[PDB]
Symmetry: C3
Subunit: 416 residues, 3 copies
């Protein structure tokens, strides 16, 4: 909640973060009973209930014609998911978990390889198909005067049909959990049943939309009158360790109308997990929510603890800070948590504006750091960048503005 501007490097650092680290996967297997619906037929000619039965059977048979045979964390995670659809048909665990879920609509159970996985039953469609609807469909009569029967049917199989749309349209693995895959109460029962300490399950529950976004779904298959799928939910088994984030902007010097520029390439996320610092170089591997930060940890890299020497004595530091270099001039804005680093050079015009006072001042050629208490908006030409009004303490560390040590090594080698 305390941000430091490195005057010496035209850069920012943002501190004060709590990890929410994805360390594992929780499997919520759902079983949707459709019922013995294949052995029902409408022979009283064309009918609305007949059209719904033919639609239901066509979507079900279309799902029975379905068969299977990236940033790093997700690929290791998918290898997990495949492992669980496999061990499922294994030893017909179906038969086992089937016996286990007749008894109840929600239960915990160790799978052949599964370490006590979650099983949730949704049987409304079979009971309706079996009880109310199948008695009205005995004797092959569907143009019944009971129009109520047709409307209950299209409403109750709607969840299954959209479920079929969601599985047929995405070739078996949705990237997240829709409210039709798992409602919120079922989502909450599954999130609540995860194996971690109290603060982690409670915190994951709060922001359960992130559990939705970071999880995904796998088709297991159709067996008779049973619909089977599984949802992989990220277990954020690690919370409240230090994280901090690093931003940087181009440092350019001009002599005689010509430019020499350099830029730090160590932007992105850093976290202190298990005695090492993990770098999440891409934005998408981590995600902020207020003061808490959600990261998939398998997406990070163990880097040496050496990054604080990149702030204190960056030229003279022992680990070589990686940088790139350039020969022709640029201009841009890298927005920061409590401001913006604005590199505004000849050829562009930059300004800061206020939602209360209007444009305050055009901003200077060179590297400038602007605070989000200072301005409400920044503009470069016609590109508009507005800014947040979030509060916290900011600080300036005075100093004059391939591995960077390979740039010093390249210059130093060419002159002797």
């Amino acid at each position: 909640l305390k941000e430091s501007y490195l005057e010496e490097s035209c850069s920012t650092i943002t501190e004060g973060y709590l990890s929410v680290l994805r360390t594992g996967w929780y499997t919520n297997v759902f079983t949707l009973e459709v019922g013995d619906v294949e052995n029902l037929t409408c022979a009283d000619g064309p009918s609305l209930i007949k059209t719904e039965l033919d639609l239901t059977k066509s979507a079900l048979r279309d799902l029975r014609t379905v068969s299977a045979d990236l940033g790093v964390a997700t690929a290791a995670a998918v290898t997990c998911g495949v492992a669980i659809a496999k061990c499922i048909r294994l030893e017909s665990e179906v038969t086992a978990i089937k016996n286990a879920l007749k008894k109840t609509n929600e239960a915990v159970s160790t799978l052949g390889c599964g370490p006590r996985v979650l099983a949730t039953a949704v049987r409304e469609l079979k009971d309706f198909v079996s009880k109310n609807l199948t008695r009205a469909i005995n004797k092959n009569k569907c143009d019944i005067p009971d129009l109520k029967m047709a409307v209950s049917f299209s409403q109750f199989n709607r969840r299954f049909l959209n479920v079929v749309r969601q599985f047929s349209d995405n070739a078996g693995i949705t990237p997240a959990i829709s409210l039709d895959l798992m409602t919120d109460a079922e989502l909450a029962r599954a999130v609540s049943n995860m194996p971690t300490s109290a603060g982690q399950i409670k915190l994951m529950l709060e922001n359960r939309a992130m559990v939705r976004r970071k999880g995904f779904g796998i088709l297991i298959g159709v067996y008779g009158s049973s619909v089977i799928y599984m949802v992989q939910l990220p277990i954020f088994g690690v919370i409240d360790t230090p994280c901090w984030i690093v931003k940087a902007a181009p440092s350019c010097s001009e002599k005689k109308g010509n430019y020499a520029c350099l830029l730090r390439e160590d932007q992105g996320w850093y976290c202190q997990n298990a005695g090492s610092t993990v770098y999440y170089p891409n934005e998408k591997d981590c995600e902020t929510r207020g003061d808490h930060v959600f990261c998939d940890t398998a997406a990070g890299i163990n880097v040496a603890e050496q990054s604080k020497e990149c702030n204190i004595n960056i030229s003279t530091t022992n680990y070589p800070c990686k940088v790139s270099t350039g020969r022709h001039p640029i201009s841009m804005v890298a927005l920061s948590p409590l401001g913006a680093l604005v590199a505004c050079y000849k050829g562009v015009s930059c300004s800061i504006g206020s939602n209360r006072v209007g444009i305050i001042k055009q901003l200077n050629k060179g590297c400038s750091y602007i605070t989000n208490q200072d301005a409400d908006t920044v503009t470069i030409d016609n590109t508009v960048y507005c800014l947040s009004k979030v509060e916290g303490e900011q600080h300036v560390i005075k100093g004059r503005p391939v591995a960077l040590d390979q740039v010093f090594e390249s210059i130093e080698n060419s002159q002797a």
Copy 2:
């Protein structure tokens, strides 16, 4: 509508374009009245209307469990969008705009920070919930013999449920405007109310599907019986300035079975806006529609006016034309507006075919330029490239085929 082939560089230039430049964002805030639907309950056991009420209340409460806390133009644009959802709950402007939209279903109004934003009301669901439906749900009786009441209910809340699907499934920010977020008449009222000159609003209206594609949606929140969302629509405030587009293909020379190749890296879009030339290096930042070109301008870079010297005297030119170089042979086709540059080298076979005459001739090893009046199709091996039949005048500029001046500087440095 006049294309020039640069024989001297194996390259094309396409001229004759009218800008449609995204210069701003128009905010269309929608208010969907759901009604006082929470205080209705069905106590006459399980029912179709009860299931619809429980579904409606579950989707609404699921949306009440929703909370928040890339090519450059879009990120600056999102900072806008966040600014507007913030200033909305501010000073409960809700209460203000609420007072303002009771009076009418469509109106203009300055927001606390909003410079006269658009407000659109859609109240059908509350009035139905309140008038026809709530009187039939008094006294907690839902298995009524009026089946008409249940069908009007599922049809009228369908817009809200798909609206809920669209907001719950995308974690609050859709990338575009579906016909369920904003119908065409509401889309047209909002596009029509934008702040620019007549030719721009009329032209944006024509191709309003691009306004759909370039805009996006933000969830604001649920308050009581009111549903609130906002749609950011791009204001293409700039039209009919010169744009032109540059394509290039590999120029390869062979000696003794060995290749030396070079390629211009200045492909992409160029526009003359406000005294500078803006380069849109990625295709997606600009989009053609006939003779008009749609660009998001915040996606471009002010480059010096020096690019025409890259055509006249490219080796000797003063700004250094950026190029890359290579040592091992390749082969490819870069399709152009009125043809194709085909670099066809040893190892591949290339041909042009006609939909009328069939294969005309196999095309030559080397760099060839083919016109879309010349052929209907071009093939390299089994990769098929067909071509358009669009008309306009083509011209050949005769000439023998890191910054390119850094390639001349590198060769020139190594021999003395």
Copy 3:
């Protein structure tokens, strides 16, 4: 089904593949009859059937307000698709194919430019609109006591409305075929009608979900009471030629706490088609299904047959094997078909685990090759990588671990 581990290069090769090569596009044009539905109006005030008619007419008119004007294979393919929507409105082939599909609901016919394209009719909505429904809507009376009429209407136009959602939401070109664009029976009739030999159509039919994923849809337009769209289905006209796939992992050597590392950059897919070897460098250009491999061939590059000399004598080989080089240490796992190459260096811990025995052993610093019969899982720190249990024969080829010859050329040039 026989995998070779190159001990000499810390690398894997997987052999035993059957091509399923996308060599062409099959066009399935669908014609959906909506009926003369515009000339029907409901004047008996507000009604459910009236709301459905107004919705249907609003979605239809919204689709009448729709107008148009990447990894390489797809872009050449889209130029195909555009060619076919063009030649369609040409010579009003509509009128021709219209005459041709009155006679039947499915037929083959050469288009003006089309080489005998497929036409499929779906007319249920017009016949219902015309026969049962239009007689009940004569005399402008929609609040009829027949509630059955309203439910048949919303069910029958549902396919058209979701069809409209799918076309309005994606700006006219879906990336694949939903079950609502083409049901499985229509999908099967179209796949079955493709121009190739028996083994190819039969095999494509098996895994028709890949035909779905690799095809896409194009809006042609609305004319009166006729809905028109086309689906481009990939014709995998080539099957059962040799393919093989190459993986590699970093080879690192340490001296005095310092690292020198190199890595082969020739990972990806290789196929023997038409006398040349085609390289599919990106995963997405090819896709495995068991022992068969699905590739879009226009996505590949003709490379010289020289790659087997990259295995036998890679340092001394004549074509220069492309490699990159590095100066600072890394650590990672590249999973393989029958195992994993695990480069585990100082700073990380790696292990293999078993679903039966538990963690077997922590894995060694250095380059290790682990078989999927050997372990069920591998872990680096907290990043979990599990593994498959697929069977086949593995083999080790003993040997001590820019173009690679440019790395030998760079070292060799700097010392003399």
